[PDB]
DNA sequence: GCCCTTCGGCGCCTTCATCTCATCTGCCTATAATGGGAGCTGTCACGGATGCA
DNA sequence: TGCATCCGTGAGTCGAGGGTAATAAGGCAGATGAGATGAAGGCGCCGAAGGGC
């Protein structure tokens, strides 16, 4: 997405400096707006910007939303060290503590 | 225990070389470079880690010294323009019999 | 805003807080859990800490 | 379909009587499509074989998820139920508990 | 060239539309180059002319 | 010519001249806007790889913008015939240096494209995948370079695509951070430093300082002998001798066993 | 020697109520199965399937 | 040849194949230099992954 | 006998590797793992005080 | 029995120029070539703009 | 002022399970940093030995 933003911005700079009919300049400005759109929130407007494998790309907003977002996946609950896991078996000879 | 490669041969005791059976006298540090080349035969050599291991870490000189030293190795044993001591651009050198 | 943004409708509350220039106090339970501070309950209050 | 598109593109760009089916044909998309299907597709999965029954039951199994199917989130309560037409066609007992 | 933040233009309330007294249907037509707006007018230059 | 080394422009040589300037401007714009249809028609065959459709259309628009300037009507051919070459050039150049996440120079994206075309043309004629040695024979170059270009053309993958058959996790969850501190070798290094300090303090202070600044322990830089002489008022041969004394006493098995274990 | 009176926490997903995490004291046991006291199963909602 | 003999017992942590990669270069610690100076150990220019 | 043997089901770690973006330890048996302490268990630990 | 102080000897060790070998960037090719491939959408409930009428 | 009409939110917990693809692109000039060369200076190290107190 950042590469798309950079490409659109550089091409718009070239169009402005060279001097082009206003239709092409307007099209480039629209592409810049849609590229920043995709960067900040992919799929919010129109069909989402898609890469290889035909899957929506993960914009900044998608990195802060839902279960898989940072807030409820890395901040609230984290994978911890000094821990393990195993099957349980009844211990009827053990004490309560 | 003598270390051999193609037509160059080294004795670890008295620090001399045979090139295709002909004994050759060579400089000490230049000999250390050749020792690195044979001890890592078939593996590419880059100027930096060559500087790191063979040379002291206090070396404040430029980078032309290693290129010149490779030139001496060429003119001493691999006098041919094409040589067993191939050079990689930006990646350094390597000891390898050409295919 | 930090607690609300981590519960539901993250983008909406985030935008609203950005507009309102809301200054969070970082005093609640979830905020202290997020930032690594002692939670303000149990052995986290100044009476016991 | 990709074959037809590419051959339709190519049949005009070349002059008549200088064009042959071999140069009209570029078999790359067909093998690409079969490789796409057989690998990295969730309807053709790794064989579950740790005893003869698992191998037998992995084939002759009716799935509902995948391309053209419905996802578990997309799946309602009605579809998961047993239809009266399931009798004799699809077993009403064998289904995973997850 | 300037661009508009989607978080504020597009949302359940269109915050930019609320501030500028417009509609999102009457904003997408502009920040996506489909219809013009009148940035400013000369009042006295029209009253006398 | 009239602005610098000119004169005050008269009535008939300023307004009319600027008017024909603007007329040529709008004529160029008119034909350009008329011929963007050719650009958008040509860009259809070019999508499906690297960049999007509209980006290709825009790059073709730039190519046509460049082409209209060099178009010569006096040569008497239709403008489309000349414009097509420039549009294709612009699109190919842009796809070469802009459609890759890892940018590749055109000079060798050319040979990737040629390698691909020759291998897939020979595959159908021979019936099998072309061995890279035979591809090199078709290259008139060494096969090793062929494997190198084959492994260069490989494009990066996405860290966030779901990796499982069922959607539960992303690829980035399974990649270890190499740059992170081990948190075990750090304590080992600190204890090794403590052992080194104890060993050096066991040795004589002059020798300890000599070796410490010889290998640059306390500071960032190891120093040559003459620095040691200037800081201890001795000749460089004496420093060589004391260094000989240092590693001679350091071969003592009392230190040798206690330090060799630390590996 | 080192497990002398060192408390250790046990948890079972899902952790519904507060008693879903309990601190016990561990005793070394052969095998590879954690031995749970039979009484605290109901609080854990744990079962041995 | 560098691999485990057929019919040989291994366990967690034992080496299976001896594959050695050129380590390239890194910061050779001064402490490493004193370490090789005490035993005469070679630089061992390759990484044992 | 079912294919849920305890040998392929016991896992524990003291200090393993960590992820790139966030420094949290990874998860799974192929990697050294580390159990997920989710927000549901955070609820229990906060309720304990 | 070796320190204080020597000429010089090529070596050697750098260092200044000073030449080539890939490697990469910009430019030109003239019959004509003139408007998207494809996308499959529809869970459940629930608060709110919304285009018109 | 309705009022359908839609449009954006919510929808679980740990564990099997790793990666899938097109196309007309080619000479040519310049430049540029890396690496190939050759030459000359500032000690090294000795090859001699001075010598005596
Ligand atoms: Mg159970």
UniProtKB/Swiss-Prot annotation, chain C:
Coiled coil: none
Cleaved signal peptide residues: none
Induction behaviour: 6-fold repressed by starvation.
Described purpose of this protein according to its UniProt entry: DNA-dependent RNA polymerase catalyzes the transcription of DNA into RNA using the four ribonucleoside triphosphates as substrates.
Subunit composition and interactions: The RNAP catalytic core consists of 2 alpha, 1 beta, 1 beta' and 1 omega subunit. When a sigma factor is associated with the core the holoenzyme is formed, which can initiate transcription.
Annotated family: Belongs to the RNA polymerase beta' chain family.
Protein name per its UniProtKB record: DNA-directed RNA polymerase subunit beta'
Gene, per the UniProt record: rpoC
Portion held of the full protein: 1220 to 1268 of 1316
From Swiss-Prot, chain H:
Domain of life: Bacteria
Signal sequence bounds: none
Subunit structure: The RNAP catalytic core consists of 2 alpha, 1 beta, 1 beta' and 1 omega subunit. When a sigma factor is associated with the core the holoenzyme is formed, which can initiate transcription. Interacts with CarD, TRCF (Mfd) and RbpA.
Function comment: DNA-dependent RNA polymerase catalyzes the transcription of DNA into RNA using the four ribonucleoside triphosphates as substrates.
Family indicated by similarity: Belongs to the RNA polymerase beta chain family.
The name this protein goes by in its record: DNA-directed RNA polymerase subunit beta
Organism, as annotated: Mycobacterium tuberculosis (strain ATCC 25618 / H37Rv)
UniProtKB/Swiss-Prot annotation, chain I:
Function comment: DNA-dependent RNA polymerase catalyzes the transcription of DNA into RNA using the four ribonucleoside triphosphates as substrates.
Similarity field: Belongs to the RNA polymerase beta chain family.
Name assigned to this protein: DNA-directed RNA polymerase subunit beta
Assembly mode: The RNAP catalytic core consists of 2 alpha, 1 beta, 1 beta' and 1 omega subunit. When a sigma factor is associated with the core the holoenzyme is formed, which can initiate transcription. Interacts with CarD, TRCF (Mfd) and RbpA.
Gene from which the chain derives: rpoB
TM ranges: none
Signal peptide range in chain numbering: none
Organism: Mycobacterium tuberculosis (strain ATCC 25618 / H37Rv)
């Amino acid at each position: 997405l950042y590469r798309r933003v950079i490409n659109r911005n550089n091409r718009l700079k070239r169009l402005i400096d060279l001097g082009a009919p206003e239709i092409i300049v307007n099209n480039e400005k629209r592409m810049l707006q849609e590229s920043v759109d995709a960067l900040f929130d992919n799929g919010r407007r129109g069909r989402p910007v898609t890469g290889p494998g035909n899957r929506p790309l993960k914009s900044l907003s998608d990195l802060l939303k839902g279960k898989q977002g940072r807030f409820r996946q890395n901040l609230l609950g984290k994978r911890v060290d000094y821990s393990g896991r195993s099957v349980i078996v009844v211990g009827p000879q053990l004490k309560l503590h | 225990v003598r270390l051999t490669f193609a037509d160059i041969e080294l004795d670890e005791e008295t620090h001399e070389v045979w090139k295709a059976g002909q004994p050759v006298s060579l400089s000490p540090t230049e000999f250390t470079l050749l020792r690195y080349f044979v001890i890592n035969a078939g593996t590419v050599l880059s100027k930096p880690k060559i500087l790191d291991h063979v040379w002291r870490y206090d070396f404040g000189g430029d980078v032309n010294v290693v290129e010149s030293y490779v030139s001496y190795l060429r003119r001493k044993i691999d006098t041919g323009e094409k040589r067993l001591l191939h050079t990689l651009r930006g990646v350094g050198y390597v000891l390898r019999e050409p295919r | 805003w930090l607690s609300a943004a981590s519960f539901q409708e993250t983008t909406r509350v985030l935008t609203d807080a950005a507009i309102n220039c809301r200054s969070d106090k970082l005093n609640g339970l979830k905020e202290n859990v997020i930032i690594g501070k002692l939670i303000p309950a149990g052995t986290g209050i100044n009476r016991y800490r | 379909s990709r074959m037809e598109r590419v051959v339709r593109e190519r049949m005009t760009t070349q002059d008549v009587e200088a064009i042959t089916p071999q140069t009209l044909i570029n078999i790359r998309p067909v093998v690409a499509a079969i490789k796409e299907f057989f690998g990295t597709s969730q309807l053709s999965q790794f064989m579950d074989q740790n005893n003869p029954l698992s191998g037998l039951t992995h084939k002759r199994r009716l799935s509902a998820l995948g391309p053209g199917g419905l996802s578990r989130e997309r799946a309602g309560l009605e579809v998961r139920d047993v239809h009266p037409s399931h009798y004799g066609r699809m077993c009403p007992i064998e289904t995973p508990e997850g | 060239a300037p661009v508009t933040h989607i978080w504020y233009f597009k949302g359940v309330p269109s915050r930019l539309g609320y501030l500028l007294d417009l509609a999102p249907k009457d904003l997408e037509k502009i920040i996506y180059f489909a219809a013009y707006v009148i940035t400013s007018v000369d009042e006295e230059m029209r009253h006398n002319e | 010519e009239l602005s610098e080394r000119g004169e005050k422009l008269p009535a008939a040589q300023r307004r009319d001249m600027m008017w024909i300037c603007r007329d040529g401007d709008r004529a160029k714009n008119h034909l350009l806007e008329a011929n963007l249809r050719l650009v958008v028609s040509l860009a259809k065959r070019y999508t499906g790889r690297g960049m999007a459709f509209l980006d290709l259309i825009q790059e073709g628009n730039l190519g046509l913008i460049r082409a209209v300037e060099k178009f010569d009507y006096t040569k008497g051919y239709k403008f489309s015939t000349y414009a097509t070459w420039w549009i294709r050039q612009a699109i190919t150049r842009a796809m070469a240096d802009q459609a890759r996440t890892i940018r590749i120079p055109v000079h060798m994206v050319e040979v990737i494209n040629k390698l691909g075309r020759i291998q897939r043309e020979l595959l159908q004629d021979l019936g099998r995948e072309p061995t890279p040695e035979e591809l090199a024979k078709e290259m008139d170059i060494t096969p090793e370079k062929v494997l190198e270009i084959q492994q260069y053309a490989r494009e990066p993958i996405s860290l966030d695509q779901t990796i499982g058959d069922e959607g539960d996790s992303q690829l980035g969850d399974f990649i270890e951070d190499s740059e992170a501190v081990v948190a075990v070798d750090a304590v080992s290094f600190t204890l090794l430093q403590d052992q080194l300090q104890s060993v050096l303090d066991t040795l004589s202070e002059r020798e300890a300082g000599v070796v410490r600044l010889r290998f640059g322990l306390t500071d960032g830089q190891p120093r040559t002998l003459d620095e040691i002489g200037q800081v201890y008022g001795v000749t460089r041969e004496r420093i060589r001798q004391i260094e000989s004394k240092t590693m001679s006493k350091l071969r003592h098995p009392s230190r040798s066993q206690v330090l060799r274990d630390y590996l | 020697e080192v497990i002398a009176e060192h408390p250790v926490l046990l948890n079972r997903a899902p952790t519904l109520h507060r008693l879903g995490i309990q601190a016990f004291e561990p005793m070394l046991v052969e095998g590879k199965a954690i031995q749970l006291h039979p009484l605290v199963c109901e609080a854990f909602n744990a079962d041995f399937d | 040849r560098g691999i485990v003999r057929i019919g040989a017992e291994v366990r967690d942590g034992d080496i299976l194949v001896g594959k050695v990669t050129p380590k390239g270069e890194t910061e050779l610690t001064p402490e490493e230099r004193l370490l090789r100076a005490i035993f005469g150990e070679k630089a061992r220019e390759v990484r044992d992954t | 006998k079912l294919h849920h043997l305890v040998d392929d089901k016991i896992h524990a770690r003291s200090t393993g590797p960590y992820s790139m973006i966030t420094q949290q330890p990874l998860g799974g048996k192929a990697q050294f793992g580390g159990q997920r302490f989710g927000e549901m268990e955070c609820w229990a630990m906060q309720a304990y005080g």
